[PDB]
Design a protein around this ligand. Structure first.
Ligand SMILES: CC(=O)N[C@H]1[C@H](O[C@H]2[C@@H](O)[C@@H](CO)O[C@@H](O[C@H]3[C@H](O)[C@@H](O)[C@H](O)O[C@@H]3CO)[C@@H]2O)O[C@H](CO)[C@@H](O)[C@@H]1O[C@@H]1O[C@H](CO)[C@H](O)[C@H](O)[C@H]1O[C@@H]1O[C@@H](C)[C@@H](O)[C@@H](O)[C@@H]1O
Ligand SMILES: [Mg+2]
Ligand SMILES: [Mg+2]
Lengths: 287, 286
């Protein structure tokens, strides 16, 4: 039968940054669809977007600075070409913020904070090039460390529901993984949340924990139905804490009991368990 | 029984968040190892300071008072000596100085924390390590790069070691037990990664992190004396070598002489469980 990891959510990682999962949640009123490029894996094991199998590749960059630009490669140094995607595998996908990436080197001492505004014309990872912003010549590996409000537009909020502008303009085609929409029926998308360091109470959402991605990529389920009915289970008591659906494209939903009672009010130490394949129209009991 | 159907080169070290770049054997001045991270038995028992998730690997959390950092678990839960040699996920890289990147919830900026693990102030088993200039506050830290140990002065990096978690080398810290080569011409197999810093630093571990989460999820009900495995090229399906996985959570093979061992294998293959065999099942070299 089809399986999800038999691991409690609070033991798992975000798939958009190497951070422990601290809660589940729903999106703000002003967010309907999302278009995350990391943390995208179908139920039959197809990785989508810039998603890697391993957290060791998540929210990382690799490239060589000439003092003006950083020419990007894949994490292992392999060339990256525009046809391959919006950015190299694992490249950070946090829109709506400035990044602070910790840069280190193979064969040299020290780390350097690389400050990334993802809005200027020089930020073109789809074409393999981003501004150096004072990073001296050399080859670096970088990992996202902390975030802050965007440099532009001035006074913008931190909005992690967004993805960055990977192309030379927002109108350049960059081979983005497609958007994910709430499927209707009163079902809402479920997000796995992590606290992100920086000068505010930042919470990073993703569609699946990273360990779900490696699990599904390994499992390569030969049978995927229209929707998987799941129970969110307390491992000790075995109590079913609520019904959820997982959809083939790689996301979970539930029907909240009301505005103040939904997946965010459930304990975070539960385990999602596959129950059965159901119709896409299967109506869930509110959680 | 299953292992991940994933190529090794797609996976992570379990002692630091680094891609796997090769398999290797131990140096000839190392017979046994005692890593505290990357320890999981075949039936899914986490051992030492090993976490389920790479998001906890080689990380620290604690509050500096400017003199010491008082440690907690990564989620802020108290850590007590009876629980182990250090909080879950705490770095286990001996034979080097650490440079840890410290960040804070609710504050800007990062700070490099330089850790000599040799002085008597380095007592993570008792929940305390020297601040070494880290100002007052609560931090989460992740290992960023390493350098040669400050003591003994002039020594080389040696990642086959673990640090001194106790108040002295004689203090009992509830270390996970050592892993020994099991006999029958078999060698311990290590999954290797390259660690940033001023040298060519090679970090070994006993299992990729994704194997840890897989085994911890799977909770195999029927573990035998040893699992016979094949290392397989996925496309071609070719068996590249017979290996054994042992219940305590390590792999072995028999090298084909001094010239040909795990290091000579390509790193894009997949370990596949074949059958349970006896502990003394004799492997074919390679
Ligand atoms: C660039 C920077 O650090 N900006 C942050 C700003 O920093 C000011 C303080 O350091 C202040 C201390 O007295 O000095 C200001 O500089 C003055 C000099 O003092 C003065 O002698 C000289 O004549 O004039 C200059 C002004 O031209 C610094 O600008 O502090 C802010 C409040 O803490 C902080 O929010 C700001 O951080 C940047 O904020 C924008 C949004 O506005 C973006 O999020 C940026 O990403 C963010 O920068 C990032 O964080 C800072 C703390 C630092 O780590 C940067 O490297 C990083 O990119
Ligand atoms: Mg689960
Ligand atoms: Mg494998």
């Amino acid at each position: 039968p089809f399986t999800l990891p038999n691991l409690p959510l609070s033991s798992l990682s975000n798939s958009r940054a190497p951070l422990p999962i601290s809660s589940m949640g729903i999106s703000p009123d002003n967010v309907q669809s999302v278009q995350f490029q990391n943390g995208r894996c179908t139920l039959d094991g197809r990785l989508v977007g810039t998603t890697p199998v391993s957290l060791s590749h998540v929210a990382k960059i690799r490239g060589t600075s000439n003092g003006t630009v950083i020419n990007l490669t894949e994490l292992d140094g392999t060339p990256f070409h525009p046809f391959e995607g919006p950015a190299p595998i694992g490249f950070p996908d946090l829109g709506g913020c400035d990044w602070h990436i910790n840069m280190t080197q193979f064969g040299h001492s020290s780390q350097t904070q690389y400050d990334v505004d993802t809005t200027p014309d020089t930020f073109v990872p789809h074409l393999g090039s981003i501004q150096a912003n004072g990073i001296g010549s050399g080859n670096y590996v970088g990992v996202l460390s902390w975030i802050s409000p965007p440099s532009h537009p001035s006074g913008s909020q931190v909005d992690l529901w967004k993805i960055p502008n990977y192309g030379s303009s927002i109108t350049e085609a960059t081979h983005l993984a497609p958007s994910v929409y709430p499927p209707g029926f009163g079902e809402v998308l479920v997000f796995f949340m992590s606290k992100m360091p920086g000068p505010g109470a930042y919470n990073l959402p993703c569609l699946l924990p990273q360990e779900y991605i490696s699990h599904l990529a390994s499992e390569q389920a030969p049978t995927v139905g229209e929707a998987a009915l799941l129970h969110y289970v307390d491992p000790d008591t075995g109590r079913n804490l609520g019904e959820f659906k997982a959809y083939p494209d790689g996301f979970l939903t539930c029907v909240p009991n009301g505005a103040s009672s939904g997946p965010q009010q459930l304990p975070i130490n539960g385990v999602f368990v596959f129950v059965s394949w159901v119709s896409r129209f299967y109506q869930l009991k509110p959680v």
